[PDB]
Write an enzyme that holds these catalytic residues in place. Structure first.
Site, PDB file in Angstrom:
ATOM      1  N   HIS A 148      21.435 -22.738   9.501  1.00 21.49           N
ATOM      2  CA  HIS A 148      20.991 -21.970  10.695  1.00 21.49           C
ATOM      3  C   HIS A 148      22.186 -21.264  11.349  1.00 21.49           C
ATOM      4  CE1 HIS A 148      17.349 -24.558  10.306  1.00 21.49           C
ATOM      5  NE2 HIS A 148      16.776 -23.404  10.649  1.00 21.49           N
ATOM      6  N   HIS A 187      22.274 -16.531   8.039  1.00 19.40           N
ATOM      7  CA  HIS A 187      20.802 -16.685   8.137  1.00 19.40           C
ATOM      8  C   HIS A 187      20.244 -15.588   9.059  1.00 19.40           C
ATOM      9  CE1 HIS A 187      16.847 -18.333   8.303  1.00 19.40           C
ATOM     10  NE2 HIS A 187      16.954 -18.583   9.614  1.00 19.40           N
ATOM     11  N   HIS A 190      17.012 -14.700  16.403  1.00 15.95           N
ATOM     12  CA  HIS A 190      15.910 -15.696  16.366  1.00 15.95           C
ATOM     13  C   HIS A 190      16.442 -17.141  16.435  1.00 15.95           C
ATOM     14  CE1 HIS A 190      16.447 -16.369  12.015  1.00 15.95           C
ATOM     15  NE2 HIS A 190      15.541 -17.349  12.107  1.00 15.95           N
ATOM     16  N   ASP A 191      17.669 -17.428  15.987  1.00 17.04           N
ATOM     17  CA  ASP A 191      18.195 -18.820  15.889  1.00 17.04           C
ATOM     18  C   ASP A 191      19.513 -18.949  16.666  1.00 17.04           C
ATOM     19  OD1 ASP A 191      16.263 -20.409  14.538  1.00 17.04           O
ATOM     20  OD2 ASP A 191      16.864 -19.583  12.596  1.00 17.04           O
ATOM     21  N   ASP A 247      11.696 -15.409   8.111  1.00 14.65           N
ATOM     22  CA  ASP A 247      12.419 -16.679   8.381  1.00 14.65           C
ATOM     23  C   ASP A 247      12.515 -17.511   7.101  1.00 14.65           C
ATOM     24  OD1 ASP A 247      13.918 -18.403   9.895  1.00 14.65           O
ATOM     25  OD2 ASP A 247      12.195 -19.245  10.984  1.00 14.65           O
ATOM     26  N   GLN A 304       9.780 -29.849  -2.462  1.00 13.04           N
ATOM     27  CA  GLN A 304       9.793 -28.355  -2.517  1.00 13.04           C
ATOM     28  C   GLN A 304       8.433 -27.802  -2.969  1.00 13.04           C
ATOM     29  OE1 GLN A 304      12.397 -25.843  -1.646  1.00 13.04           O
ATOM     30  NE2 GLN A 304      12.439 -27.683  -0.370  1.00 13.04           N
TER      31      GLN A 304
HETATM   32  O1  LIG Z   1      11.916 -26.658   2.524  1.00  7.08           O
HETATM   33  C1  LIG Z   1      11.672 -26.632   3.723  1.00  7.08           C
HETATM   34  N1  LIG Z   1      10.846 -27.546   4.274  1.00  7.08           N
HETATM   35  C2  LIG Z   1      10.229 -28.589   3.425  1.00  7.08           C
HETATM   36  C3  LIG Z   1       9.177 -29.468   4.193  1.00  7.08           C
HETATM   37  C4  LIG Z   1       8.910 -30.632   3.206  1.00  7.08           C
HETATM   38  N2  LIG Z   1      10.220 -30.736   2.545  1.00  7.08           N
HETATM   39  C5  LIG Z   1      10.563 -31.978   2.007  1.00  7.08           C
HETATM   40  C6  LIG Z   1       9.600 -33.004   1.916  1.00  7.08           C
HETATM   41  C7  LIG Z   1       9.946 -34.197   1.277  1.00  7.08           C
HETATM   42  C8  LIG Z   1      11.229 -34.301   0.714  1.00  7.08           C
HETATM   43 CL1  LIG Z   1      11.793 -35.733  -0.105  1.00  7.08          CL
HETATM   44  C9  LIG Z   1      12.107 -33.230   0.820  1.00  7.08           C
HETATM   45  N3  LIG Z   1      11.752 -32.113   1.440  1.00  7.08           N
HETATM   46  C10 LIG Z   1      11.192 -29.632   2.793  1.00  7.08           C
HETATM   47  C11 LIG Z   1      12.227 -25.549   4.566  1.00  7.08           C
HETATM   48  N4  LIG Z   1      12.013 -25.552   5.886  1.00  7.08           N
HETATM   49  C12 LIG Z   1      12.462 -24.570   6.663  1.00  7.08           C
HETATM   50  C13 LIG Z   1      12.242 -24.592   8.162  1.00  7.08           C
HETATM   51  C14 LIG Z   1      12.625 -25.855   8.944  1.00  7.08           C
HETATM   52  C15 LIG Z   1      11.146 -25.526   8.690  1.00  7.08           C
HETATM   53  C16 LIG Z   1      13.154 -23.489   6.140  1.00  7.08           C
HETATM   54  C17 LIG Z   1      13.384 -23.434   4.765  1.00  7.08           C
HETATM   55  C18 LIG Z   1      12.920 -24.466   3.947  1.00  7.08           C
HETATM   56  N5  LIG Z   1      13.121 -24.429   2.558  1.00  7.08           N
HETATM   57  C19 LIG Z   1      14.109 -23.659   1.898  1.00  7.08           C
HETATM   58  C20 LIG Z   1      14.222 -23.679   0.505  1.00  7.08           C
HETATM   59  N6  LIG Z   1      15.170 -22.950  -0.083  1.00  7.08           N
HETATM   60  C21 LIG Z   1      16.010 -22.205   0.614  1.00  7.08           C
HETATM   61  N7  LIG Z   1      15.933 -22.157   1.928  1.00  7.08           N
HETATM   62  C22 LIG Z   1      15.017 -22.856   2.593  1.00  7.08           C
HETATM   63 MG   LIG Z   2      14.614 -21.429  14.125  1.00  9.95          MG
HETATM   64 ZN   LIG Z   3      15.535 -19.136  11.305  1.00  9.61          ZN
END
Ligand SMILES: O=C(N[C@@H]1CCN(c2ccc(Cl)cn2)C1)c1nc(C2CC2)ccc1Nc1cncnc1
Ligand SMILES: [Mg+2]
Ligand SMILES: [Zn+2]
Length: 313
Positions: free
Chosen positions: A68, A72, A106-107, A217, A269
């Site tokens: 963040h 970003h 935004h962040d 985002d 993921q």
């Molecule tokens: O993945 C994201 N949230 C998932 C929710 C469930 N997840 C989870 C569940 C169980 C385990 Cl064992 C591991 N993980 C992770 C994610 N979230 C945000 C914002 C905070 C909400 C932004 C980007 C994101 N992904 C991303 C992927 N690649 C590159 N950039 C961002």
């Molecule tokens: Mg944010």
């Molecule tokens: Zn953001």
């Protein structure tokens, strides 16, 4: 007035694409942002001396956290740049102005901690803002910088337009609270599917802008695999640090934030691509067809995460 920004040929070409990565040269990012404002908005939109000063105060008020961060902020403005460039006629002059600045802001002042953690920690910001705790903070920071001297980038707008654009930016920044994405999309989904969606309806426009902000985002999930793979490391770096701070409050964090549960990240993921990402770009493509490349790229990364689980990498 006749001082155009110009990028090297590879960037000049690749910056129009959705999957563009802004690269590791921090000192280029401000120029990249001013190029995007010029093409997306116009050379006349902002006073170049004010914009530059605004850009650098924003940069200063982002923190050195794994995800963040300043990169970003600019990555999210690039995605918003690409959407606006591919949807040339759909958005007003104040929206294109407001939205690129919204994305960059935004962040602002993010500490690498979720709203949940601020609540459980009993952070002062939680007492001041009970929901969308960080996002209201982010907007508050934006207004603070706008009001610094020589930072009012909107000073040519009427008093009424100035209020409009700060309303666009507030709603835009609030929409990046993912807790609010789920209901927003479902409402957009039904409006599309019953065919009652209407871009002349200001209540409807806000929802669509809301979705655009989620899309922008989350846009690290819409890059080529190597960029998405390596960005996933930075996000979990923040997640695992927060989990540590949860344990320090005597709370076992959810597996997503537990570093002793790395093994479960691939499956985590999938859930995220299936539950959040794909639905987000699907609905966005339905309302703005020329954003289809965000869906395609998202599907490509979903497929890559299945390959991870099958041990093919
Ligand atoms: O993945 C994201 N949230 C998932 C929710 C469930 N997840 C989870 C569940 C169980 C385990 Cl064992 C591991 N993980 C992770 C994610 N979230 C945000 C914002 C905070 C909400 C932004 C980007 C994101 N992904 C991303 C992927 N690649 C590159 N950039 C961002
Ligand atoms: Mg944010
Ligand atoms: Zn953001």
């Amino acid at each position: 007035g006749l001082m155009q920004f110009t990028l090297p040929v590879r960037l000049c070409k690749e910056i129009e694409l959705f999957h563009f990565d802004i690269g590791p040269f921090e000192n280029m990012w401000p120029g990249i942002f001013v190029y995007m404002v010029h093409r997306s908005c116009g050379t006349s939109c902002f006073e170049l001396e004010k914009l530059c000063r605004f850009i650098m105060s924003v940069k200063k008020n982002y923190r050195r956290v794994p995800y963040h961060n300043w990169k970003h902020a600019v990555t999210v403005a690039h995605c918003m740049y690409a959407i606006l460039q591919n949807n040339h006629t759909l958005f007003t002059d104040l929206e294109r102005k407001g939205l690129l600045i919204a994305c960059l802001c935004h962040d602002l002042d993010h500490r690498g901690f979720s709203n949940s953690y601020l609540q459980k920690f009993d952070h002062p910001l939680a007492a001041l803002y009970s929901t969308s705790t960080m996002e209201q903070h982010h907007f508050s920071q934006t207004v603070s910088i706008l009001q610094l001297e020589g930072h009012n980038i909107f000073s040519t707008l009427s008093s009424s337009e100035y209020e409009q654009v700060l309303e666009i930016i507030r709603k835009a920044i609030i929409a990046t609270d993912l807790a609010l994405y789920f209901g927003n999309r479902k409402q957009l989904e039904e409006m599309y599917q019953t065919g009652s969606l209407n871009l002349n309806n200001q209540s409807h426009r806000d929802r669509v802008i809301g979705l655009m902000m989620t899309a922008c985002d989350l846009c690290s999930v819409t890059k080529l695999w190597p960029v998405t793979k390596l960005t996933a490391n930075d996000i979990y770096a923040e997640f695992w640090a927060e989990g540590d701070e949860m344990k320090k409050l005597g709370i076992q964090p959810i597996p997503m934030m537990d570093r002793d549960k790395k093994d479960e990240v691939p499956q985590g993921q999938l859930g995220f691509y299936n539950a959040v990402a794909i639905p987000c770009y699907t609905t966005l493509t339905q309302i703005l067809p020329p954003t289809e490349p965000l869906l395609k790229a998202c599907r490509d990364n979903l497929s890559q995460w299945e390959k991870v689980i099958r041990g093919e990498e």
